[PDB]
Amino acid sequence: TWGVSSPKNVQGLSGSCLLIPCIFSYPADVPVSNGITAIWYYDYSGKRQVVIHSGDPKLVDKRFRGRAELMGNMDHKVCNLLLKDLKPEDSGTYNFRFEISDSNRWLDVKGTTVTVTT
Numbered sequence: 833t834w835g836v837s838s839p840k841n842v843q844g845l846s847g848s849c850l851l852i853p854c855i856f857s858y859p860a861d862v863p864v865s866n867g868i869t870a871i872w873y874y875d876y877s878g879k880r881q882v883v884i885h886s887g888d889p890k891l892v893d894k895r896f897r898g899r900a901e902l903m904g905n906m907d908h909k910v911c912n913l914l915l916k917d918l919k920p921e922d923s924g925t926y927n928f929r930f931e932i933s934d935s936n937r938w939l940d941v942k943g944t945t946v947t948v949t950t
């Protein structure tokens with residue numbers, strides 16, 4: 833019962849900040865010996881730019897640096913994403929991924945679509 837659940841659609845005004853509520857889950861029998869890495873991707877099937885990367889921010893795309901931050905407690909299985917200072921180009925799909933081990937990792941196939949308005 834691996835899974836990720838975040839809203840299908842979210843809306844925000846340009847210049848404003850927007851939060852994407854998110855929670856996830858995985859089997860109680862999976863050992864977690866090195867924490868959980870959290871990663872949010874923008875337009876995964878297109879440009880696939882990294883929005884947030886808890887294991888190493890250097891992987892974060894330059895256009896999202898300083899404008900996106902993770903408001904999630906990995907221990908409580910919360911992956912809320914906060915996007916600050918919204919821009920028209922931020923419109924698109926965001927998909928969350930968490931990694932516990934080489935084989936125990938997961939990418940949400942659904943994802944959340946953001947729409948930025950004037």
Ligand SMILES: CO[C@]1(C(=O)O)C[C@H](O)[C@@H](NC(C)=O)[C@H]([C@H](O)[C@H](O)CNC(=O)c2ccccc2)O1
Nearest residue numbers: 834858876927929934935936937938939940941942
């Ligand atoms: C693609 O390979 C992996 C992965 O995400 O690294 C291997 C990983 O072991 C596996 N995790 C588990 C617990 O089975 C993982 C997982 O099957 C996928 O991330 C699930 N998501 C999707 O199937 C998917 C497919 C298309 C688009 C987006 C997501 O695939």
